[PDB]
Amino acid sequence: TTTILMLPWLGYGHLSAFLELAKSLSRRNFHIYFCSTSVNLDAIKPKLPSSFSDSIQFVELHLPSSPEFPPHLHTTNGLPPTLMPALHQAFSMAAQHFESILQTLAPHLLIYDSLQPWAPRVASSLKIPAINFNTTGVFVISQGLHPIHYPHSKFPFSEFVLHNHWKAMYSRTRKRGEAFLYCLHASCSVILINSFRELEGKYMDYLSVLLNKKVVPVGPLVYEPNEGYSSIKNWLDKKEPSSTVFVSFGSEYFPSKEEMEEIAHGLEASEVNFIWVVRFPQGDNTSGIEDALPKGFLERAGERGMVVKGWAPQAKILKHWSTGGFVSHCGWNSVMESMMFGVPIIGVPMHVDQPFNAGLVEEAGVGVEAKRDPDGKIQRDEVAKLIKEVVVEKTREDVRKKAREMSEILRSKGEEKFDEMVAEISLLLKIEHHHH
Numbered sequence: 001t002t003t004i005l006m007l008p009w010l011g012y013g014h015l016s017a018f019l020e021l022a023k024s025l026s027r028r029n030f031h032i033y034f035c036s037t038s039v040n041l042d043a044i045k046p047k048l049p050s051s052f053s054d055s056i057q058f059v060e061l062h063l064p065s066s067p068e069f070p071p072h073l074h075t076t077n078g079l080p081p082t083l084m085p086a087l088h089q090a091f092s093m094a095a096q097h098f099e100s101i102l103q104t105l106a107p108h109l110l111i112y113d114s115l116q117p118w119a120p121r122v123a124s125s126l127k128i129p130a131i132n133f134n135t136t137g138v139f140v141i142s143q144g145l146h147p148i149h150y151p152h153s154k155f156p157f158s159e160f161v162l163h164n165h166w167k168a169m170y171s172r173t174r175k176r177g178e179a180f181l182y183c184l185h186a187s188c189s190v191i192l193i194n195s196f197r198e199l200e201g202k203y204m205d206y207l208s209v210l211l212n213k214k215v216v217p218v219g220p221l222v223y224e225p226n227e228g229y230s231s232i233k234n235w236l237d238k239k240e241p242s243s244t245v246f247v248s249f250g251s252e253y254f255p256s257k258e259e260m261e262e263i264a265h266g267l268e269a270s271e272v273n274f275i276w277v278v279r280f281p282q283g284d285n286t287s288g289i290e291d292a293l294p295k296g297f298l299e300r301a302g303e304r305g306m307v308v309k310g311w312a313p314q315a316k317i318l319k320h321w322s323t324g325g326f327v328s329h330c331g332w333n334s335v336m337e338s339m340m341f342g343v344p345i346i347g348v349p350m351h352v353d354q355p356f357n358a359g360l361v362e363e364a365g366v367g368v369e370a371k372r373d374p375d376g377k378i379q380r381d382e383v384a385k386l387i388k389e390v391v392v393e394k395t396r397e398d399v400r401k402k403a404r405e406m407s408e409i410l411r412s413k414g415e416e417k418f419d420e421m422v423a424e425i426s427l428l429l430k431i432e433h434h435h436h
């Protein structure tokens with residue numbers, strides 16, 4: 001039996017994609033060692049059915065710990081944004097423990113995420129083949145990589161233009177980009193990517209050309225589940241079909257009080273029904289739902305609005321018939337889920353790869369992006385406008401139509417989605433066994 005150790009990045013969204021990939025390799029007669037911090041393994045084990053206990057084994061990775069950076073903060077999930085540099089640094093310092101795990105378990109293959117250049121380095125030193133699995137899309141990577149080589153040539157196939165807010169943000173930055181691209185470039189033989197050709201095919205081909213690496217799509221990797229929901233469904237069941245937006249900014253972003261004000265006033269002016277997940281970082285004692293929102297906002301919204309604190313059953317909400325839209329930060333898993341369930345996206349991207357994802361959503365026609373003003377600020381009138389058009393007044397039915405067509409395409413895919421990955425792993429291991 002071929003054994004695979006998988007090392008995701010310490011983000012819930014990355015962990016989620018890695019587990020869905022682990023299940024698929026499970027079903028193709030691979031044994032999976034799933035390695036992350038204990039706080040991350042605690043958050044992900046509930047998502048793994050008991051049927052995989054003999055196929056998927058969780059392995060603990062130790063990060064350096066301090067009373068001020070204790071193990072329960074060894075994740076991006078709810079992490080204070082000012083601790084994100086410490087988490088990246090602590091993660092790199094787990095290379096020694098990672099090497100000892102590889103020597104103890106001696107897996108035949110390492111599948112590693114895009115945010116740990118030390119991981120392929122440790123694997124090569126132990127003569128273990130290592131493959132990058134990139135849990136996000138193609139579009140960002142190629143849109144970012146093209147202007148470095150061809151600053152005077154227009155990006156092919158797209159009309160997307162990056163807003164000056166993110167062009168300044170990503171102008172330290174060089175070091176993180178070089179680290180990110182290294183984990184793709186150093187992958188052996190192929191890069192596995194969490195995307196599908198119906199959405200990004202021509203960008204996958206172009207990226208393979210820019211990187212001089214073979215790119216293998218592993219498809220949309222969407223988790224589908226089988227306390228919170230009961231109360232929420234009772235509220236949603238009283239609404240009209242396709243009348244309600246879900247509002248979420250992911251697992252590792254906390255909008256500013258001023259950003260929340262623009263989102264809230266946009267929801268108010270649109271008169272839509274809404275369910276809004278409001279989260280606070282793990283150390284915040286000073287913040288609350290009423291304080292975080294404009295005064296009187298929820299009493300003006302009345303029964304049109306519901307605020308969920310902490311965490312919501314995102315997939316179940318997106319699948320409810322009353323959901324007509326998704327006001328989302330356009331994290332990659334959120335985008336894949338919304339297409340899988342046929343829900344139009346109202347893009348409010350925030351940072352990293354989200355502004356690119358929003359561009360791709362807009363280009364694919366399965367959603368619309370709320371544009372920021374020239375200074376990079378979210379605009380309550382743009383949010384209200386798009387919710388009105390897409391959900392309330394329904395003058396943008398092309399977006400619903402194309403999202404539903406995309407969901408039928410995705411629902412039609414099966415385990416053949418993983419044939420190309422499995423054949424490339426097979427070939428790589430057969431070749432590396434000869435070279436010893």
Ligand SMILES: C[C@@H](CC[C@@H](O[C@@H]1O[C@H](CO[C@@H]2O[C@@H](CO)[C@@H](O)[C@H](O)[C@H]2O)[C@@H](O)[C@H](O)[C@H]1O)C(C)(C)O)[C@@H]1CC[C@@]2(C)[C@@H]3CC=C4[C@@H](CC[C@H](O[C@@H]5O[C@@H](CO)[C@@H](O)[C@H](O)[C@H]5O)C4(C)C)[C@]3(C)[C@@H](O)C[C@]12C
Binds near residue numbers: 179185
């Ligand atoms: C800096 C370098 C890796 C950084 C890495 O540096 C490596 O680090 C290793 C050591 O690892 C460290 O040591 C460990 C322990 O030992 C750990 O402790 C620790 O964590 C770990 O960091 C060393 O062994 C390596 O020697 C060293 O390079 C770090 C420091 C992050 O790691 C990164 C990797 C990606 C990269 C390699 C690019 C991607 C691909 C391309 C080139 C441009 C030229 C090519 O593009 C083509 O050409 C164009 C025109 O030219 C187009 O025309 C054409 O379309 C296009 O196709 C092409 C394909 C090569 C890059 C854009 C290039 O710009 C430099 C890039 C960012």
Ligand SMILES: C[C@@H](CC[C@@H](O[C@@H]1O[C@H](CO[C@@H]2O[C@@H](CO)[C@@H](O)[C@H](O)[C@H]2O)[C@@H](O)[C@H](O)[C@H]1O)C(C)(C)O)[C@@H]1CC[C@@]2(C)[C@@H]3CC=C4[C@@H](CC[C@H](O[C@@H]5O[C@@H](CO)[C@@H](O)[C@H](O)[C@H]5O)C4(C)C)[C@]3(C)[C@@H](O)C[C@]12C
Binds near residue numbers: 084115
């Ligand atoms: C293609 C790359 C530009 C390449 C170019 O980078 C630019 O190059 C410019 C000039 O480069 C110099 O000149 C050239 C020619 O002149 C070279 O020849 C020369 O070698 C070089 O020195 C610099 O001016 C710029 O500063 C520099 O950005 C190179 C490297 C080729 O250089 C572009 C730029 C922005 C980028 C780097 C992203 C922004 C930030 C993030 C990553 C995703 C992963 C990371 O986000 C993580 O993921 C989250 C989870 O999703 C969080 O959980 C987690 O916490 C978070 O950390 C993080 C922070 C890295 C990106 C979204 C990544 O998807 C693609 C990236 C678009």
Ligand SMILES: O=c1ccn([C@@H]2O[C@H](COP(=O)(O)OP(=O)(O)O)[C@@H](O)[C@H]2O)c(=O)[nH]1
Binds near residue numbers: 011012330335
């Ligand atoms: O209240 C919430 C917020 C997020 N999620 C899940 O957390 C993941 C977020 O991943 P994404 O890539 O969209 O954004 P990230 O949090 O990584 O920035 C998705 O699978 C969501 O379904 C959820 O279930 N409930």
